[PDB]
Amino acid sequence: AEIGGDHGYNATNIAAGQTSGAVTQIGPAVMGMVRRAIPNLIAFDICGVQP
């Protein structure tokens, strides 16, 4: 009669793996990284260039 438990849903426990149950998981897997998008240039046609 053994309990698997849940993390407290506290973001502190879930990241450490603390668990009320029998097992403390290694950690929170990974779902991948979310970067921030690189915003766009307006290019230079709007103004004469002349390198």
Partner 1 sequence: STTTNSNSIGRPNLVALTRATTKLIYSDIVATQRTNQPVAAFYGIKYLNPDNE
Is 28 within 8 Å of 18 (Cβ atoms)?
A: no
> Does position 49 bind partner 1 by CB under 8 A?
no
> Does position 26 bind partner 1 by CB under 8 A?
yes
Determine the Cα–Cα distance for residues 19 and 13; give it in Å rounded to an integer.
Answer: 7
Task: Compute the least distance from the CB of residue 1 to partner 1, in Å.
Answer: 9
Task: Retrieve residue 24's tokens.
Answer: 């403390």
> Does position 27 bind partner 1 by CB under 8 A?
yes
> Does position 5 bind partner 1 by CB under 8 A?
no
Is the CB of 17 or the CB of 21 nearer to partner 1? 17
Determine the Cα–Cα distance for residues 24 and 3; give it in Å rounded to an integer.
Answer: 12
